Amino acid sequence: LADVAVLYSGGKDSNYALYWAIKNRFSVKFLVTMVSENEMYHTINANLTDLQARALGIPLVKGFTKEVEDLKRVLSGLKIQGIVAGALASKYQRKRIEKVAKELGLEVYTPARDAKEYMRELLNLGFKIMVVGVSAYGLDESWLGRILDESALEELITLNEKYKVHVAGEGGEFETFVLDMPLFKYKIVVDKAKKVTSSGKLIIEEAHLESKLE
Amino acid sequence: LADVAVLYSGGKDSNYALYWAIKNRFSVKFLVTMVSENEMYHTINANLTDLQARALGIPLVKGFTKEVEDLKRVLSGLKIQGIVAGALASKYQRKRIEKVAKELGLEVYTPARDAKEYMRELLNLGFKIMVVGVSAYGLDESWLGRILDESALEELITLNEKYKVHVAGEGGEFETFVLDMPLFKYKIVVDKAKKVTSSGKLIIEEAHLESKLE
Ligand SMILES: Nc1ncnc2c1ncn2[C@@H]1O[C@H](COP(=O)(O)O)[C@@H](O)[C@H]1O
Ligand SMILES: Nc1ncnc2c1ncn2[C@@H]1O[C@H](COP(=O)(O)O)[C@@H](O)[C@H]1O
Numbered sequence: 001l002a003d004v005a006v007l008y009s010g011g012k013d014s015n016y017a018l019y020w021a022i023k024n025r026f027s028v029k030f031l032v033t034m035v036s037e038n039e040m041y042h043t044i045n046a047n048l049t050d051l052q053a054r055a056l057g058i059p060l061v062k063g064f065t066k067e068v069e070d071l072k073r074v075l076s077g078l079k080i081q082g083i084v085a086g087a088l089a090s091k092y093q094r095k096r097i098e099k100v101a102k103e104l105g106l107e108v109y110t111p112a113r114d115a116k117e118y119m120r121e122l123l124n125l126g127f128k129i130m131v132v133g134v135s136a137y138g139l140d141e142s143w144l145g146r147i148l149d150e151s152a153l154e155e156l157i158t159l160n161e162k163y164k165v166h167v168a169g170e171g172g173e174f175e176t177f178v179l180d181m182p183l184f185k186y187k188i189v190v191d192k193a194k195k196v197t198s199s200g201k202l203i204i205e206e207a208h209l210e211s212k213l214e
Numbered sequence: 215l216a217d218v219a220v221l222y223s224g225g226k227d228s229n230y231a232l233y234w235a236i237k238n239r240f241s242v243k244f245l246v247t248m249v250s251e252n253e254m255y256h257t258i259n260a261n262l263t264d265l266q267a268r269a270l271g272i273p274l275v276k277g278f279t280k281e282v283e284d285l286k287r288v289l290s291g292l293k294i295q296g297i298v299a300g301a302l303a304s305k306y307q308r309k310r311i312e313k314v315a316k317e318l319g320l321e322v323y324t325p326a327r328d329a330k331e332y333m334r335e336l337l338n339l340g341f342k343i344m345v346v347g348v349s350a351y352g353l354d355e356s357w358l359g360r361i362l363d364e365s366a367l368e369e370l371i372t373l374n375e376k377y378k379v380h381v382a383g384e385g386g387e388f389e390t391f392v393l394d395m396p397l398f399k400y401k402i403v404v405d406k407a408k409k410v411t412s413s414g415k416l417i418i419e420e421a422h423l424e425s426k427l428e
């Protein structure tokens with residue numbers, strides 16, 4: 001029952017879900033990423049979680065796509081007992097997870113919910129988070145490619161207590177990409193990104209792994 | 215017993231093994247690629263089989279690494295009955311496959327061996343094969359990035375009946391990458407490659423998928 005697969009899309013919560021699972025003695029046999037044609041090229045920006053999976057040394061399973069049926073199809077081919085998803089999964093995402101899980105007879109392990117507290121915990125845990133998506137007023141394109149720290153957290157809280165932008169970007173406020181965390185054996189360094197409704201998006205063009213102190 | 219995983223590294227034989235398996239009514243649940251640090255960047259040249267897996271629509275499992283222990287670890291997490299490998303696997307490769315297979319209690323399905331005949335069959339089946347590796351005298355860097363056809367086959371046979379270079383590159387003579395085959399839903403187009411003992415190597419920098427007639 002310790003054998004599980006983590007739904008990994010690359011952002012702060014997928015990574016927190018991974019850290020949580022490992023710390024709670026779970027046996028993460030696989031990371032699972034679903035790729036939809038809804039978003040074809042050679043750029044690394046297509047295999048970002050693939051870059052993180054190498055930093056982690058953990059096997060990565062990639063599915064392709066009614067995404068519920070495709071997900072269940074992928075997960076059904078794995079020798080696992082449960083599915084690990086972050087406690088910040090979309091209100092809709094949780095429904096799909098619950099549905100496929102039940103139908104497959106799998107457990108839905110999830111971290112047992114204050115935005116501020118959560119965000120602070122990630123920083124204290126050594127999470128290196130970069131903003132790669134933005135879709136909320138009060139967040140100019142300047143936020144793209146920017147890393148979050150005790151400083152950026154303030155600006156988020158200050159922005160929240162004004163434009164009411166979620167502190168944990170819960171709801172599409174902004175997308176993230178984790179460049180480093182305690183479990184990474186290698187750090188991810190962005191060499192070239194270049195930025196593109198107040199909808200922003202950072203397309204990573206050049207990136208590489210760098211060994212950590214260890 | 216129909217459920218299997220194909221050891222897919224991207225070349226002509228991995229793809230032939232895949233085609234053979236699908237045609238023989240096997241249920242290919244996953245493609246498995248092992249990535250070793252023995253060969254760190256963002257280039258697509260790292261996720262080439264990932265590009266093919268999208269063209270195929272088949273889930274891809276990627277392992278990281280005694281590669282035998284790592285392979286068995288990956289395959290042990292999949293709900294399969296056997297392993298599919300091409301009949302051209304290295305004389306050593308077959309030993310590892312047999313070892314892990316036996317230890318996991320899995321079947322080792324493999325295509326039931328004339329080089330010329332084999333190479334001709336691939337062309338007749340519509341295989342679009344590009345040379346991305348070279349390590350044999352009589353094969354100048356001009357062969358890198360070159361596509362194989364009834365014409366290139368002759369030059370290979372003519373070269374064989376002289377420098378004794380294997381027709382199926384069996385033994386490290388040359389590495390390949392399949393840009394298209396009947397099972398691909400999309401074709402792979404190389405936009406920018408640039409070439410690098412008579413050891414040659416083609417590093418693909420730009421590539422993309424293009425829809426097929428269907
Ligand atoms: N294939 C998937 N299906 C459903 N939910 C997913 C999938 N992949 C990732 N997630 C959820 O996405 C959340 C993380 O989003 P993020 O912080 O941007 O990486 C996690 O809490 C997961 O539960
Ligand atoms: N992870 C692996 N372990 C052992 N053999 C492999 C692995 N991946 C691919 N192969 C073998 O590599 C052969 C294909 O080489 P190629 O034609 O260059 O793609 C196949 O016949 C497979 O049996």
